[PDB]
């Protein structure tokens, strides 16, 4: 479906990440940066790691396998060895419920 209910916005602390599993599709990661919410593909583009098992530092997610990293707002690589941008998914808060797009931007 177009918008996927994740959780209540209050169920995520600043600087945390939640994995969103999807029937028939690859998982997403939702990130809380301050009061804002962002989402990418959960699988690192450099390999098979889950970015939701990584470390968030401001708006940069660090992959747990090789220390590559991405900007979670843009999906662009921030650290080697990552070179392929992440798919970015729109997040909206409606009645304090977090929703993530089922299709990536562009």
């Amino acid at each position: 479906q177009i918008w996927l209910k994740v959780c209540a916005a209050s169920d995520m602390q600043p600087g945390t990440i939640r994995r969103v599993n999807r029937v028939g599709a690859a998982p997403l990661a939702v990130y809380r940066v301050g009061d804002q919410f962002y989402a990418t593909e959960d699988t690192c583009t450099h390999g098979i790691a889950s970015l939701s098992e990584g470390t968030l530092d401001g708006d940069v997610i660090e992959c747990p396998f090789h220390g590559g990293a991405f900007n979670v707002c843009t999906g662009m690589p921030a650290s080697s060895p990552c070179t392929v941008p992440l798919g970015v998914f729109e997040v909206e808060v409606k009645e304090g419920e977090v929703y993530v797009a089922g299709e990536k931007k562009l």
């Binding site: 450099h46 390999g47 098979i48 747990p64 396998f65 090789h66 220390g67 080697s80 060895p81």
Partner: protein, 388 residues
């Protein structure tokens, strides 16, 4: 110890494994066959960077470090065993007991204060299934079974094999061994045609991550290992395609092999059944130094009497050794060698781009990182260094 700290900081999932270039200390390792070491004829080898001497005395095996305490020469440059129970350094005649390494005499100075006060390093040695295992470690050893795969030590299991030195780091040999997708390199092996094997080109995995392997960290004998379960939910590939066109087919023979594949610390693969439905392959990748390993191959077949054993040996000689140990696994050897350059500067551990079937490899890296019994270091080789 062994690798730039900037690399170890990056590989958060398995830094101890990446650091373990010289191998894991405090495990048993096979180094030769029993029939290669004769009564009173010491043999030299290098294990985990350390030069060792093995001798058979009254049929029992003893292992001393092949490095005199005095000026650090190898005793083996000129072996002088002047009594049954001793070896005498060729240089200034420091004399050591095989049994405990104690410096018991010095022929150049029998009044020396060093006599009875120093000890040359000894390691436990155990023969099992015609194979010589050395415990490259400190303190009283664990049971050998801890560091062997299931069934290897079975009473009825008859073990034959082959050993040789290969020019790659041991971990490249392990990963190649345990890698489910590497079956591709075996697609034109003579074993496939000439023993009528079913052999896919690869696997389309299915299920979640956890379902791809079974981690054993709860074996009663203390064995620690990983089973590769890719084929439990996976569709095996028998038709490989480019742009939708078939370009290659797997092998559609009758004989089903390699149902269960498992890797065990310290680095020994079990493939069951293989290379025939009624046999098993066990192979070790034993660290010699940073660049080399023993590829210590064994085949197991249950046997009930000398009739069955002798027939097994003839078949081993005429078929299994040439067709399987060589005709199949020779391609693994140069595959190992081909990875050397990427990992030689330790940057391969960061730059490798993994895909789905590498989940087996990752599970092994984590298991090895968490349950190894110590990291061998160059200081172990040269002499331990500390200010307490």
């Amino acid at each position: 110890a062994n690798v730039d700290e900037a690399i170890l900081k990056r590989v958060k999932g398995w830094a101890p494994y990446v650091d373990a270039k010289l191998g894991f200390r405090n495990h048993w390792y096979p180094v030769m066959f029993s029939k290669e070491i004769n009564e009173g004829e010491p043999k030299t080898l290098k294990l985990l960077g350390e030069n060792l001497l093995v001798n058979r005395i009254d049929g029992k095996l003893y292992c001393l470090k092949d490095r005199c305490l005095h000026r650090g020469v190898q005793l083996s440059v000129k072996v002088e065993c002047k009594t049954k129970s001793t070896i005498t350094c060729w240089y200034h005649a420091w004399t050591y007991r095989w049994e405990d390494g104690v410096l018991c005499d010095i022929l150049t100075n029998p009044t020396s204060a060093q006599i009875g006060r120093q000890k040359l390093k000894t390691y436990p040695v155990q023969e099992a299934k015609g194979c010589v295992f050395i415990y490259l470690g400190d303190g009283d050893p664990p049971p050998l079974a801890r560091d062997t795969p299931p069934n290897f030590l079975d009473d009825d299991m008859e073990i034959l094999g082959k050993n040789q030195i290969i020019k790659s780091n041991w971990r490249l040999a392990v990963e190649n061994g345990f890698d489910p997708s590497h079956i591709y390199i075996h697609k034109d092996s003579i074993l496939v045609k000439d023993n009528d094997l079913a052999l896919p080109l690869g696997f389309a995995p299915g299920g979640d991550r956890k379902q791809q392997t079974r981690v054993v960290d709860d074996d009663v004998v203390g064995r620690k290992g990983v089973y590769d379960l890719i084929g439990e939910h996976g569709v095996p590939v028998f038709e490989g395609t480019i742009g939708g066109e078939v370009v290659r087919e797997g092998a559609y023979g009758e004989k089903i092999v390699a149902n269960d594949i498992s890797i065990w610390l310290p680095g020994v693969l079990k493939v069951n059944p293989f290379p025939n439905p009624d046999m098993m392959q066990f192979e070790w990748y034993v660290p010699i130094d940073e660049n080399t390993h023993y590829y210590f191959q064994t085949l197991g077949k249950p046997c009930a009497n000398d009739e069955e054993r002798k027939k097994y040996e003839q078949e081993f000689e005429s078929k299994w050794k040439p067709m399987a140990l060589e005709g199949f696994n020779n391609d693994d050897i140069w595959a190992r060698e081909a990875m050397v350059d990427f990992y030689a500067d330790d940057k391969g551990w960061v730059n490798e781009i993994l895909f789905e079937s590498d989940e087996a490899i990752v599970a092994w890296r984590k298991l090895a990182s968490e349950h190894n019994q110590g990291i061998q270091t160059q200081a172990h080789v040269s002499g331990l260094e500390h200010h307490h």
